[PDB]
Amino acid sequence: ANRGCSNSSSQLLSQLQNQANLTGNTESLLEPYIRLQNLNTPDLRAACTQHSVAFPSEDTLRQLSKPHFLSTVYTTLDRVLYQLDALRQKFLKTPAFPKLDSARHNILGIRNNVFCMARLLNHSLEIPRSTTTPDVFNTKIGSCGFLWGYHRFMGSVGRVFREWDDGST
């Protein structure tokens, strides 16, 4: 509880911005997954960009206030963690894919940082299945679209954090 996340706010904001800039990069998780699943054909990439999971847009995030924005970021990161856990429990090969664990640790760090930032502003955050797969092509396409949407959402949240740092009202 009080054993971390000191009262420094500028350092926390800088850490959040740096984590967002580091995570919002296609070479982090999407490109290794594409190069591993043999999806380098232009038609396969078009199918990847076609199927897109519904993520909050940039204008919606910019229109919200600060506590609502933090709560939506928390919920979206929780959903992303759940989806990554499902993908890990469906792939059944941990040693051939450490980028998944790296992204999971990064998302956990971002979640800790946003929780600490919300606690510093005297705001309370909102507190709340089949292993086998019939087809594999549809699963690959869905995972590709989910990773694309996740990277776009990370870029959007990084831009919103940059605008917040520019404002500093």
Binding site: Q37, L44, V136
Partner: protein, 184 residues
Amino acid sequence: EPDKSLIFPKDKVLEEGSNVTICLMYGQNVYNVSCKLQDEPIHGEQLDSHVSLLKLNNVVFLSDTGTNINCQATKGPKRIFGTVLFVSKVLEEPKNVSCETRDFKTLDCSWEPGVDTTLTWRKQRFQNYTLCESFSKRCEVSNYRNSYTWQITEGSQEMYNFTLTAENQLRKRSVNINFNLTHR
């Protein structure tokens, strides 16, 4: 469905160097279906007015994740549909199988596993190595790939006739060894 299409079989597990015939059945509104491999055309034969057969000869191993077969229709509904073709390697026979004794209690047998034939998805996971002796009728799945520590029961029996077996979802190889307890 008049606006959909199907393809069989789905997620087929084959051996490197075999043949396969993939069938494709589209609806009534779909027209001029053209299937492709990773990057190459495929000359399909029309078995009927609404069916099309794809023939592949001497498939080659590409990766442990399978070869994606994407098939896109030029006319009608513009989308991409297809299946993954899982190709596995050939299972080899254990080479230089020999065992030894140290204190008349354990037998540390060792061998060569060969080439790995394990896929990544839920298709093919296990590659078991079973060692069953004849005079005792004992065999359990070993937890290692190229080693095993045998436990001999008391009785001062000096004879052995083993039969190591490697089995996967496709084939099953076997090799027999014969030795003596005091001579090793």
